[PDB]
Amino acid sequence: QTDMSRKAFVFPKESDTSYVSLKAPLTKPLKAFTVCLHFYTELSSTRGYSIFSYATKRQDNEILIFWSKDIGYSFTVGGSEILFEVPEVTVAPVHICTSWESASGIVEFWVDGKPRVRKSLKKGYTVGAEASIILGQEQDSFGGNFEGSQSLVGDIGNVNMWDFVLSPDEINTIYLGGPFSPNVLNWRALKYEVQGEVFTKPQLWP
Template sequence: MPVGVVGGWGVSPHPAQSLCLGAADKMTAWIQPYPPAPTMYHQLMLSCEVTGDASVKEFLWEKKGSREPLQKGQSNVLIFSSFNKSHLGTYTCTATGPQGTAVATYDLWINDLVNQVFVFPRETKDSYVVLRAKPEQPLLNFTVCLRSYTDLTRPHSLFSYATKAQDNEILLSKPKPTEYRFYVGGQFVTFRVPESFSESEHACASWESPTGIARFWLNGKPWPRKGLQKDYAVGAEAVILLGQEQDNFGGGFDVRQSFVGEISAVYMWDRELTAGEVRDAMYNSPSPAPIFGWRNLPYKIHGEVYLKG
């Protein structure tokens, strides 16, 4: 699967707790969600992973508060075809094999930020939002979307994805009100836009490795395609920030590039979106399911940033 959630925000503050019974001191279990940051009304799978015993015969799935088991048999996967709030709760997987039994628990919850925004009230060099997710493998395609509202006329960063090898691995920024810059692997293309301070702007940027084609949409309208970094692979070990530009891995902030204003509706996919899918993202109805997004955002605030309705 393409991504994994880092830290304690998003789906579960404690992804798995394992308890070994009987002769299972060499057998452990944990529960892994796919995708790690699920989206409402899309498919979600919980996978009960076991180490120490390759011949597990039975998996028992239970939910706290339910009298009857959810599933019992040889399948280690529990599938929700359309994940919704009725599925929230604590789940237990009991794996039984010749070496004994291992039990894993998982707290499934969602952090839906629809109708809310991150407010960055003033210039700082230490206020930002960390998006606590990362790819598990290099990206050959991706799309990033977000909505911003600001009256800044100086350069500022919107979305900063840095690796140890490249601080501008992915960067969406505005050097001035009439220009967006989209970086991949340290190189950038420019998209010129009308100046507007009277309303928020919804921007999406996508890139594909085989052709190097980069696309940009502003408020659902596509701009002419451009190209950069053909056959490049975006690194997986990343720090992802809103509100500051990283000049090194996870730091190197410059107050003169900090964001002041509001950011919301942040999404990232490991594929290019169609025009219709971009419009869906504008209204917080993402399809297909993103790597992470506003309907279940794994984040942590640092400094003076506020989540407001």
């Protein structure tokens, strides 16, 4: 447990080896989740890259938040992909929240406090509880098989995770800096393992 308030991980150059593993304390697989984070990179108009990689032994892309070059955000649950297209590329730190619900198949994707349209993905599915959660790289195996061309060059912080769906009002307060209590991953009480060229500095965003 580390309090990472006002701190962010920094991956200053492209690599195959720099990553942070996030220790999720769980048993019950997930019928729903919400993932929020800040990140900052210039890669957006040169190549794709992995924002948040959640892998299980049977599924490498169990939850994957990814950026596809000339497309926008790619959201994947259980190997199935949905896109959140972005016409114009923004050059500044970005806060995203994303949720998915098994019961309904509804995914929500929130960019800088503003919501994209609701979409459907993996209705009735269950996300596995024994996971390998990675920042800075895209998993192709449980905890490994990284590709440098999918690596995050930049900052990533305020990563949080819930095992239910956040409401629009709740997302609004997280974004506005208000109080909250995540029950899967907590930035303020995070367990983690650093590997490779990655540093802990003060966050660049306000």
